[model samples]
Target chain A: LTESYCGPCPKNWICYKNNCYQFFDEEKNWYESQASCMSQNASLLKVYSKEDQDLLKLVKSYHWMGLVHIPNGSWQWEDGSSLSPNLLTIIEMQKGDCALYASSFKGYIENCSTPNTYICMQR
Target chain B: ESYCGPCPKNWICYKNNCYQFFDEEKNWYESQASCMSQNASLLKVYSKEDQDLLKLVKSYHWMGLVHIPGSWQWEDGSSLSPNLLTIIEMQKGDCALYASSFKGYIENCSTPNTYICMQR
Candidate 1:
């Protein structure tokens, strides 16, 4: 019998492991980017593991991440967890309120109002 | 809002397929029957990654491979690929059982064990 068949991930999204990821080249502010993801019932890409961050290497340019500098002076994920630097190397959070992922470097700190491309992920 | 698509309820979406680990122990034939009842099939490892997905589970579970006529074959009648996964001790029996750390092992077809079910 022919066992080959299509996968469950939606069109225009890349399926890895069990997660579906989609990188949007359209530029938008951090909040707007998150909203865009929410409309599709997904969330901004969260880099929880080294493998999770590794998937961002496919993006050619900087894209908004689900991370931000909170009022408590801590880098926190949109999911409410503090950043785990051991997972991916970040380029020091000197003066930015938002985080963006770059294929060249692991991460970059940026202004929350800055319009940039972004990635979204769903299960 | 909650997102529910692709895989059915109670099944986990992994890679290109949906999977479920059945805790209830049953013989090889009964296990296959249970999976078929759900419109799925006994777990078939198509690649090292496919096998690795279930490797985190340390329990012994019945897989879809069996030594039917001569060599091992999957539920889809495809022959087991060489070097994909090492099935240790084929002398045990005709049915294949999954072992997390050791990869796989041959076992008696009538032996009751937990099993996995998979669907596209």
Candidate 2:
């Protein structure tokens, strides 16, 4: 019915295993990047795929994923999904609550106030 | 030559290292292999002076560092000495490259880009 039931990812979206990923190259803070995504009818990327992460890494040197941290050392995804501790190392010493998927650094802590590029997912 | 002798052709000698800036674009994996094939590996950021010089360039280029398991180091497993630079969360390419801004970031192995090589 073309009612957004995961058929095709429109245009400019990269298809991987049926999910569409769009990378925003402009720089923005976490909230700003997320807002940019929602404006495009997508959401900040929430991912952990050994497959897709590699693709994302190729697209940009640094981009935001959809994860945030609580000061007490807990982590959560943008969609409220439970976080898997085995997936990433949490950095409490960094300056932010939002998580940046840095290629060499992996999931690094960055204050949400800092500007960064972002990735969007359409699924 | 020197300050005392001459560096080999196409190489710049500075601070006890012979450096070459290969302008051709190549993927990180291929780039690293090229450096080693020529008897050098990817370049490493080993000092403050070298770090400052790279930032002065303000462009993107490949380096020898990579993300292995949980930490970042040069291809030779030398320690990473960073100058406190980055913009966002950082993966699969899992290799390290530097920018004109003097920041370090991991990149994929497939995308092609110019790279720096070092011989000591």
Cα displacement (angstroms), candidate 1, residue A81, comes to 11
DockQ agreement of candidate 1 with the native complex: 0.02
Error of 1 at B81 (Å): 1.4
Instruction: After superposing candidate 1 on the true structure, give the runs of residues whose Cα lies further than 4 Å from its correct spot.
Output: A1-123, B1-5
Report DockQ per prediction, comma-separated: 0.02, 0.02
Model 2 ranges with Cα > 4 A deviation = A1-7, A51-54, A57-60, B1-120
Q: Per-residue lDDT of A1-123 in model 2, one digit per residue for the tens?
A: 011122145433444434556666689999898888888777788766655344443343667878887766777877777676446565643577897776543677788888888888863
Candidate closest to the true structure, highest TM-score: 1
Score each candidate by Cα lDDT: 0.74, 0.66
